[PDB]
């Protein structure tokens, strides 16, 4: 939930937004 999210974690959240 922080600024220092890894690139893979950023991927996952946007991927989950796209799905929903």
């Amino acid at each position, epitope marked *: *939930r*922080g600024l220092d*999210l890894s*690139e893979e*974690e950023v991927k996952k*959240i*946007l991927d989950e937004i*796209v799905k929903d």
Partner: antibody, heavy 117, light 108 residues
Framework: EVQLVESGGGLVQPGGSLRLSCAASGFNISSSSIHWVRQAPGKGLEWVASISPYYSSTSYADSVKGRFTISADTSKNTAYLQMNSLRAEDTAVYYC??????????WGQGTLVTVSS | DIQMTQSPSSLSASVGDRVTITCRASQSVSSAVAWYQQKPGKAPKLLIYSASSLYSGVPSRFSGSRSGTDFTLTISSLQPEDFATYYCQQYYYAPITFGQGTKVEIKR
């Protein structure tokens, strides 16, 4: 119904202070990052500062450190940019945006700040 | 500090044509690159994240790719709704950097 609505811009004297705010709807600001990005007239996008409202952690572009402060209040679902020692160079449209990390997946329509005597 | 060098600064293309915008980073940003579209007088909208993933609502004609340090956004056939300015971004680490933008204008 995801929204980001900026307010607090306007015309301000050089060397003055201005506080921008960004009210968010349709999501909790502690679930993502909040970013301030500005666009001087006729120019590109320039990142200003970011915050994780959940951790309260912040980061800043070199040219605003010390004289700008980004903060957030989760109980108001709102973020802020306190701008001090304003210069002509800070004249711009200031967008608020949300997204994980430093990705910016939704942007508000921005507020115009004009710094002039 | 990461520089993002985007090219060209502007281009003119006809409707139905293929357009290619590239962004060259100063150092490795892995795949932590996004692309944004900005129409005049409006907020940018996210089109591509992690070099090659299309965001919500973005039609199948936009595509993104990476080769090492170079990043590319392609539109297969320019449609009139695609006139805008386009920006690359690295979200690898702060300070965050956007490329200078590319204004796509249609031919006539």
């Amino acid at each position: 119904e995801v929204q980001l609505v900026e307010s607090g811009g306007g015309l301000v004297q050089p060397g003055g202070s201005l506080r921008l705010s960004c009210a968010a709807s349709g999501f909790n600001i502690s679930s993502s990052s909040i970013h301030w990005v500005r666009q001087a007239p006729g120019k590109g996008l320039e990142w200003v500062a970011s915050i994780s409202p959940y951790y309260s952690s912040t980061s800043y572009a070199d040219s605003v450190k010390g004289r700008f402060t980004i903060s957030a209040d989760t109980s108001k679902n709102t973020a802020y940019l306190q701008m001090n020692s304003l210069r002509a160079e800070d004249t711009a449209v200031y967008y608020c945006a949300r997204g994980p990390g430093y990705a910016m997946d939704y942007w508000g329509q921005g507020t115009l700040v004009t710094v002039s005597s | 500090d990461i520089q993002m060098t985007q090219s060209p600064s502007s281009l003119s293309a006809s409707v139905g044509d293929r357009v290619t915008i590239t962004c060259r980073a100063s150092q490795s940003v892995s795949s932590a690159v996004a692309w944004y579209q900005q129409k005049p007088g409006k907020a940018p909208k996210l089109l591509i994240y992690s070099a090659s993933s299309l965001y919500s609502g973005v039609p199948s004609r936009f595509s993104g790719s990476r080769s090492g340090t170079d990043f590319t956004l392609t539109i297969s056939s320019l449609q009139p709704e695609d006139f805008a300015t386009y920006y690359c971004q690295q979200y690898y680490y702060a300070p965050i950097t956007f490329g200078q933008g590319t204004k796509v204008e249609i031919k006539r």
